[PDB]
Chains A and B, each alone.
With several copies, the nearest count.
Chain A
Amino acid sequence: PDMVLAYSDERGYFIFDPNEEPPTGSGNGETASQVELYIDLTKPLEGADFRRYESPNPSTITLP
């Protein structure tokens, strides 16, 4: 019938199906997954061994 059992979320999207499960879990600002993705993007090459590129040692080969 008429759109009486209709609702919208905080972002302006409307759901017209009373039996459709609405998405949830949007109230946790600064989500941990977002923080992990941000760390992966803004800080690449973290934990890499670059000590070899500033070594003045003429011998770069390890032998017994």
Chain B
Amino acid sequence: KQLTPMMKMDLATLGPVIRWMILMYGVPVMYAPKKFMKYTNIKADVPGYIG
């Protein structure tokens, strides 16, 4: 849910420096928490052992 997309808003000049910032507002919402799942403690060693 996006309140606003990613955008830049320029800051005030308080010296010989140019400043600006980039902002984004939002939140992810999952309506059904029981229609997802996770695997934990998986072992994977692609650069394996030779010898």
Direct touching of A and B (C-beta under 8 Å): yes
Q: What's the count of A-B pairs with C-beta under 8 Å? A: 27
Interface of B is mostly: loop
**A21 is an interface residue with CB less than 8 A from chain B:** no
Residue total for B at the interface (Cβ-Cβ under 8 A): 8
Query: Across the interface, which residues of A come within 8 angstroms of B19, CB to CB?
Result: 32
Query: Across the interface, which residues of A come within 8 angstroms of B18, CB to CB?
Result: 30, 32, 35
**A31 is an interface residue with CB less than 8 A from chain B:** yes
Interface residue stretch chosen among B5-13, B27-35, B37-45 = B5-13
**A44 is an interface residue with CB less than 8 A from chain B:** no
Interface of A is mostly: loop
B25 to chain A, nearest CB (A): 16
Task: Compute how far the CA of A30 lies from the CA of B18 in the bound complex, rounded to whole angstroms.
Answer: 8
Taking CB as reference atom, which chain B residue is nearest A31? B10
Tell me if B10 and A32 are in contact (CB < 8 A): yes
**A8 is an interface residue with CB less than 8 A from chain B:** no
Task: Compute how far the CA of A28 lies from the CA of B9 in the bound complex, rounded to whole angstroms.
Answer: 11
**A residues at B contact (CB < 8 Å):** 25, 27-33, 35
